[PDB]
Amino acid sequence: NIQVVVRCRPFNLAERKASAHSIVECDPVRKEVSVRTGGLADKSSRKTYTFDMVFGASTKQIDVYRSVVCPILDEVIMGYNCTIFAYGQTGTGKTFTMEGERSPNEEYTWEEDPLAGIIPRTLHQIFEKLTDNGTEFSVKVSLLEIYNEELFDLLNPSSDVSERLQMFDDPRNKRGVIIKGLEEITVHNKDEVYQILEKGAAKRTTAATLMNAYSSRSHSVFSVTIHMKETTIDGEELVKIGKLNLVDLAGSENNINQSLLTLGRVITALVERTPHVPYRESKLTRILQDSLGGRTRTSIIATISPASLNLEETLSTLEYAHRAKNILNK
Ligand SMILES: CN(C(=O)N1CC(c2cc(F)ccc2F)=C[C@H]1c1ccccc1)C1CCNCC1
Ligand SMILES: Nc1ncnc2c1ncn2[C@@H]1O[C@H](COP(=O)(O)OP(=O)(O)O)[C@@H](O)[C@H]1O
Ligand SMILES: [Mg+2]
């Protein structure tokens, strides 16, 4: 039930000049990804995996958004909760996929930049879709991050990255949690989106100077909650609440990342039908337990590299993402 898609990134500039051969091949029409394990394009051994969707190196940000995000956003707009994880080794495109980047030399505006990823596209699109049809709504975003099992708020502009947040069990709705002090910022309109993201980027820079390899070891959960009051052309007012969680996971390569370790164990217990699922052994899995065998529709995007130097990690990533397909939720 949990949908898993794989995204291979293209070779970089240093890999083009070194005339690198790709050990990965994608077949989108067949939802298949094949990896060269033995060696030689003349004769070789290979490993194949089938997923729900596979995107090769030529896949652009707009292809990812239209194919995977648009339908998930529709569901969120219907009043459901959805979560999208980005899993893969550092350098394979987790952040590029979830957030995207700016094209160099101020070539475009943020809302037209083709390098934009899921988060900016999603936020710009929520306003583009609800502003049209008569729907009163409010958008709240939150950015919670985890480093060495400590919680941080990367959007609060009056607290620094040395102030960790506290987490408690929610006595109201079971298997849910309360994060003391997590700031929820209201996004009044599309033109307010970009600076919110800029502020987050800037605060992440300070977190990076204070914590070792922060961008590689931290987990980031960017949540966008949409409170809606849709009035059809008749006079029916549908009050709906939808929440989308965009999770950029810590690099999967192999000191100890308790949340990453626990995520793997939670998935293993879920697909092996084990009665006890270790949700509580890490903050990530407690915060997102409804996304792992719960009532939230979730998808995983496994990012990989086509370079032969990353063979072991690419296989580990694919193998991990393949097992995830067997998780059932809702
Ligand atoms: C804001 N920014 C980005 O590239 N960003 C940062 C970013 C982002 C930042 C966060 F905290 C949390 C979630 C996010 F998604 C995504 C983009 C973006 C925004 C609109 C169009 C294309 C890409 C600056 C980062 C620092 N260099 C200049 C660009
Ligand atoms: N699909 C892609 N197309 C073009 N460049 C990419 C793609 N994916 C990743 N890259 C590039 O690869 C590098 C790895 O980026 P990043 O997203 O930060 O990786 P990660 O978050 O997995 O550690 C960046 O310089 C980025 O611009
Ligand atoms: Mg990263």
UniProtKB/Swiss-Prot annotation:
Family (UniProt): Belongs to the TRAFAC class myosin-kinesin ATPase superfamily. Kinesin family. BimC subfamily.
Function as written in the Swiss-Prot or TrEMBL entry: Motor protein required for establishing a bipolar spindle and thus contributing to chromosome congression during mitosis. Required in non-mitotic cells for transport of secretory proteins from the Golgi complex to the cell surface.
Tell me which residues make up the Kinesin motor domain. 1-327
- Please name the disease the record associates with this protein: Microcephaly with or without chorioretinopathy, lymphedema, or impaired intellectual development: An autosomal dominant disorder that involves an overlapping but variable spectrum of central nervous system and ocular developmental anomalies. Microcephaly ranges from mild to severe and is often associated with mild to moderate developmental delay and a characteristic facial phenotype with upslanting palpebral fissures, broad nose with rounded tip, long philtrum with thin upper lip, prominent chin, and prominent ears.
Q: What is said about its interaction partners and assembly?
A: Interacts with the thyroid hormone receptor in the presence of thyroid hormone. Component of a large chromatin remodeling complex, at least composed of MYSM1, PCAF, RBM10 and KIF11/TRIP5. Interacts (via C-terminus) with the kinase NEK6 in both interphase and mitosis. Interacts with RARRES1 and AGBL2. Interacts with TPX2.
Which residues are noted in the entry as ATP-binding?
88-95
How would you describe the post-translational modification of this protein?
A: A subset of this protein primarily localized at the spindle pole is phosphorylated by NEK6 during mitosis; phosphorylation is required for mitotic function.
Give the gene name. KIF11
Protein name, entry field: Kinesin-like protein KIF11
Question: What parts of the sequence cross the membrane?
Answer: none
Residues modified as N6-acetyllysine:
129
Q: Which organism is it from?
A: Homo sapiens
- Localization annotation: Cytoplasm; Cytoplasm, Cytoskeleton, Spindle pole
Query: Which part of the entire sequence is included in the shown chain?
Result: 18 to 362 of 1056
Q: Which domain of life is it from?
A: Eukaryota
Q: Which cysteines are joined by disulfide bonds?
A: none
